[PDB]
Design a protein around this ligand. Structure first.
Ligand SMILES: c1ccc(Oc2ccccc2-c2nn3cnnc3s2)cc1
Ligand SMILES: c1ccc(Oc2ccccc2-c2nn3cnnc3s2)cc1
Ligand SMILES: c1ccc(Oc2ccccc2-c2nn3cnnc3s2)cc1
Ligand SMILES: c1ccc(Oc2ccccc2-c2nn3cnnc3s2)cc1
Ligand SMILES: c1ccc(Oc2ccccc2-c2nn3cnnc3s2)cc1
Ligand SMILES: [Zn+2]
Ligand SMILES: [Zn+2]
Ligand SMILES: [Zn+2]
Ligand SMILES: [Zn+2]
Ligand SMILES: [Zn+2]
Lengths: 360, 360, 360, 360, 360
């Protein structure tokens, strides 16, 4: 009888960075039909399918007849986790950011391509709104990337503070997506904390999202254990030494990142853990401009790492990006130039400032 | 010795969307007897049996002699879960609703067919009662389907508020069945919450059923953690970003849906999460008409997604439905036309309004 | 080497409805000795042995030499669970009651037979006592069976209320045995509730036994969470929609049944969930008659489903039973006629009323 | 290569009623050496070894070379549990007591035999002390055995009440050993109760040992949940219906037995559950006689089921015992007659009454 | 291919009493190199290596090439546990103490031998200090051994009471090591107690170390649940009946031993459980002598079972030890005689009494 190549299934999982045994199984089974008569290959809208179908066709036919499908996929997924362990220890943090930028650029090549449905001008409208959120915004994002890549002890965490719908949640979500990190909830009691902190294993960056304090009920702010919990996690935030994380599973320097919170009282000991604090104040023109440009909210553009990378490609020269992605940055600069100019971009920012629709 | 085709058992599970290892085992074993002398095939009342018996007969005989029956069925059920993972990521939300409508139409073809026992006029009486529950009811249902399919951030959740037996529970149950979602209970403490929220993995929509608040004991309303819990789940309700769900198991945008509750105080922060609120007030004629038309309650017609789809087929033209199901909508319109007219339907609604039996 | 037929072991488990892996193993090993010299076969007092020994003799000899006995039995027991899953979805509720009546009649054929030790006149004395417990008792039982078979939403639960030794516990236990359901304890906190509710999976009916309330300590009634718990289980009691039961394991309409309790205060919201309430008041003559007819208590006759089925066979004509069991009802009517008459039965009820021994 | 007989290892486990996988493994490995030069066989002090060595010698040599020893023993132990399941359902309760008496008689044949070290006169001295503990003591024990064998609902539990060292703990321990039951601790909260009650699965009888109440601290009695817990276990104590026991594992009538406690207040509802209450009052002569006859305490004679069976063999005629053990009762009566007379036994009881050493 | 002898690996584990799967694996792998060029064999300082290398060399080479190393070692370790189960039931308690004394003598033969580093005069200095701790100390130790071997009900537990550094902890630790028992912590709540009590399974003796009471905070003594817990464990301490221990795992008479505690109030009911109480009072000369003879503390001599056995070999004649070890006691008496005399031993005790260095 024909033998299935476990190595080839693993190669597919490695090429697509697949961490889900069931997703892998389903995707691999979808390669068993003839690629010449494959409608998914003709549509060319799913690269994880159309770029691999021909290569995996004969192996997928054998896989379809297998009595050990889950085990083949478990070894493949384990190899992906094994590669991630090797990279977390050998890859430089700049190489880690290049890998994430390449993932975002692959997604951008698709959604703004011939077989995609995204509108590039709508994402550029988001770029204009984001550039209006803070002064020197391209420098804010660039200096955040430097903070994450350099990973300097005591200079690794930024604090985002402000009320609801102030751009604080949005910017933190977009920066998380740009770097490719994980969000954490520390509003739970200390008993469940260690399992939640374990989510940061092999992660590039993290966001401690919507951290709550106590005694702010008189200002309509909810009570939580967040601020108290974070104040007892100095070694995790500082990154001077390795911490023991469990989900024990790994001993590593806890990832850098962001803490987001409303207007709670910050203890002196927790305040000292942040190299920078950004205060987010709601601006009437930002909300108005957003209400007039609904596509931004509907298509989740403002929370996208692709929007922040387009901002960077728009504002920053080729030399500001790592050498390994220079060719892709140049091709994206040519693409953006065809559709927007410094004059039309300036009009978009002027439209934001007036609380009018960003696109005329 | 003869070898059992694991692929064929998987094909049966895929064709019937079987997610239960024991149900699959029992159903497959029932294919081992000769289909020519099969009473279940002659009765033709169970499509998951009579449409598959002949195809799986020889394989079921081999399956009956197997010493590894549970393992064969586990791989089959896993393949169904794998396909669901692939669809949750590749299928458009319109395609997801088409699949559910096709499932409801298959059930309708059976129960209102030659080998079925349901009475089509009784379901149409339910359509009349439902159309009397709210003004422009066909538009209410249609706009709910648009809300679920479009899945727009901050515009994904509807609030159903009213006392007991006000039509609030019934409409939410019928909309859940129409879309094919899951019901959730958030009246438990935060410690058990994450396991309950994990029920929403790969789901099209959800209902947070009978959410309880505090301090409404003086108005005979029970105390619960529901309203407090929902107020701490902004990212789940908004759908702006992906949430980490566990039953970790999957990172996804939490499904859209409905929250149902009695007349509790809604906090300003939780109130802002609903794009629409429908207030359900008990009407004496609705209860009276129901008491005179007992078949509605006895046969669970008012809670049925089939009743809401019949309402849609009755009120809305063919172009209001997706192109993929147009042929089935046309055949159902012809079926309904033979049994009810706009005049006889209007009499049914007039009978509801008088609190008299819906069917004369 | 000889191969054991897993299919034949499964067939034995299916024929005896065996749900216990260890019981199956022990019963099957007892078939390895020669049936011609088998004392258990000569005694003919255990049908699960003597009706299967000859058929399974050669396979049991091979089974005795097996190095995988537990696994063979696990697949057999799993097939029994698989069949139960298929029946819970395809069998009509009338067919489910026929299956239970046939199980009770098989037991009756044995204990009142040539190789049995039960005294039919003693069970008929129990029939007389039960018929004295409530007016029109044969109608009470028959209408309960109709309630369970019909399974109508909001009309599925009966409330049995009274002090200790009032016939309330006895009648509920006997009705449970007649239908073949499970008893549930809801006096535990909500944290453990879901695991207990999961006991109702694939069950025909349930009894929420000895439900306790609060603040009745001044009337010597114990405190418990029962009444509070049941008041938060409307969807389980009503049966309008399917509930998610776990022991997740199955999504189904929660079984119908009975709630038994002492004289606690019932909340308006929980009271509305019962289509009928029966109040049990202790009668001095019932206790006295029981003290004079000790065999009833000693032989567990009053709690037996066989006693309630004998009551039905005695009072009701052949047409009141399903067509599938008519031949067995006729044979039991002939058996009862040989031993009791309407005159001698009337004397037994007169003896109950006088608090004297039921049998003269 | 040579094959190990799993059936033969199972036969050894069945013959010795072995329920411990590790004990079985160790005992079986001790059969691998030549029985002709076996010192354990020459000593003849361990029947579970010397009566099986020759039969299992060749199989034990093969077992010694096995790479699957634990699995062979697991199937053997499982078969013992399977046989116990079959017996719990088919064996009459008289047959269950015969099996226990035969186990005690096998132990007695050994310890009072040529290769034993026990002194029969010392056990008879214990018989005299036990016969002085309560009036008509041989009738008390005999009526307890009738209570356990008959297992009549509401007439299955005896209450033993008294202070420390009153003979209450001793008699209950000796009756437990005589019947072969299990002791239970119900002084724990209700949360852990069900796992403890599960210890009664397939058991002949149980003792709820040293049950504690509340508010008796002013009388130097410790506080506990025992009495409160037992008051909520009516169905377990009454034995009118089957209870669901877990360690779910089995549905059965909870075993009969004894409840022992100090002088706590017994609630009216819990008091009604006992068919008999024995009050144990400390007697100065009993303690004094015991202090003068130390061998009773040192050799654990007063807590032994062998002491109670010797009491029965001494006081009761052959016809009072089941027919199956008549030959063994006759041989033990002849043995006792050689060493004690009704006159010398009467002197022993007179010595107890004087608080002097029982043996002159 | 070559086959590994599982029996031989088991034989090594049995010979070294190995209860650690990982230790066994590591020790066995260290036998794969040539014994002629083995530095560990030339050093001759580890008997578990040098006395087994040659015997296991060829099997260890095959073991090194095995793909099932952990499983081979698991069966070996299981056989050691199986042998321990057999011995716990068949070995006399005197034979159990002989086995422990032989283990201590093997260790003594090594550390005081040609390839050892211990100084015999330093251990004899410890013997002198220990003999100064209590009057008739050789009789105290000997009577403790009699108490443990005889294991008489109600006469099995000794109480050691005194403040910190009073010799109480040291003597209890040394007696534990001499007998080969386990230490237990009962200062935890009753919920975790049963798992801790399960540590006493198959153990010769136990020490309930540093038991804490309540309300002694005014005397600088810490609060704990120890004394309260022990007061509810009468059946465990008395040893009149078998207790059910879990880590259920085994039904056995709980081991005898010691309870150590500071000056807390002992309840009358717990006090009655001890056949002997030793009060430890700090003596200034004992601490001073210890400060001048640092090697005692540095080399853990005072806590050693070897020190107590040397005390016994020094003070007691050959007939005081079991016949099986007489030859080893004689050889150790000759060894001690070469290095110390009754005169030089008396000088050591005089040096202790003066608080001066024990060795001149
Ligand atoms: C409806 C409701 C809220 C809403 O606000 C936002 C929604 C998403 C992301 C950002 C915002 C805002 N950021 N921002 C800064 N200054 N004012 C604002 S609002 C927009 C529409
Ligand atoms: C008996 C008890 C209750 C009952 O009520 C209902 C039962 C099921 C579903 C809906 C209803 C009602 N919906 N509605 C709206 N205005 N009044 C009402 S009653 C009907 C019969
Ligand atoms: C001893 C203790 C109690 C006892 O009572 C009963 C025992 C079992 C089942 C039913 C009863 C009673 N049912 N009933 C109705 N009116 N009075 C009564 S007593 C009988 C004997
Ligand atoms: C030392 C400490 C206690 C002790 O008491 C006993 C020990 C074990 C078993 C029974 C007893 C007693 N039963 N009994 C009846 N009337 N007085 C007594 S004492 C004996 C010696
Ligand atoms: C430093 C700190 C403490 C210390 O005490 C000891 C250390 C270990 C073992 C025993 C002792 C003592 N046993 N003992 C009896 N009378 N006084 C004392 S002290 C010695 C040095
Ligand atoms: Zn393709
Ligand atoms: Zn068929
Ligand atoms: Zn037979
Ligand atoms: Zn032997
Ligand atoms: Zn060596």
């Amino acid at each position: 009888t024909k033998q299935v190549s476990w190595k080839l299934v693993t190669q597919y999982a490695l090429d697509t960075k697949c961490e889900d045994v069931f997703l892998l199984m389903g995707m691999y089974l979808n390669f068993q039909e003839a690629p010449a008569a494959c409608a998914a290959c003709a549509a060319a809208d799913q690269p994880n399918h159309f770029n691999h179908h021909e290569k995996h066709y004969y192996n997928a036919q054998i896989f379809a007849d297998s009595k050990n499908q889950k085990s083949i996929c478990q070894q493949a997924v384990d190899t992906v986790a094994a590669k991630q362990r090797v990279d977390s220890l050998h890859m430089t943090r700049e190489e880690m950011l290049v890998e994430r930028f390449n993932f975002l650029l692959d997604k951008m090549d698709l959604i703004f391509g011939a077989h995609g449905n995204a509108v590039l001008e709508q994402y550029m409208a988001g770029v204009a709104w984001i550039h209006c959120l803070l002064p020197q915004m391209d420098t804010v994002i660039y200096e955040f990337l430097k903070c994450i890549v350099l990973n300097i002890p005591k200079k690794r965490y930024w604090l985002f503070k402000g009320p609801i719908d102030s751009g604080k949640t949005t910017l933190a979500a977009a920066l998380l997506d740009l770097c490719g990190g994980k969000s954490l909830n520390v509003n739970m009691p200390l008993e469940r904390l260690n399992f939640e902190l374990g989510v940061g294993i092999d992660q590039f960056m993290v966001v401690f999202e919507d951290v709550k304090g106590t005694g702010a009920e008189s200002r309509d702010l909810p009570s939580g254990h967040g601020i108290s919990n974070l104040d007892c996690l100095r070694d995790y935030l500082d990154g001077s030494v390795k911490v023991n994380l469990e989900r024990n599973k790994r001993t590593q320097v806890f990832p850098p990142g962001i803490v987001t919170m409303n207007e709670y009282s910050v203890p002196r000991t927790l305040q000292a853990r942040f190299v920078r604090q950004i205060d987010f104040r709601p601006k009437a023109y930002l909300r108005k401009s957003l209400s007039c440009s609904e596509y931004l909210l509907e298509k989740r553009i403002l929370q996208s790492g692709m929007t922040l990378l387009l901002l960077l490609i728009w504002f920053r020269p080729v030399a500001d990006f790592a050498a390994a992605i220079h060719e892709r940055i140049v091709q994206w600069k040519e693409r953006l130039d065809l559709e927007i100019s410094m004059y039309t971009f300036s009009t978009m920012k002027a439209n934001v400032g007036m609380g009018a629709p960003i696109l005329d």
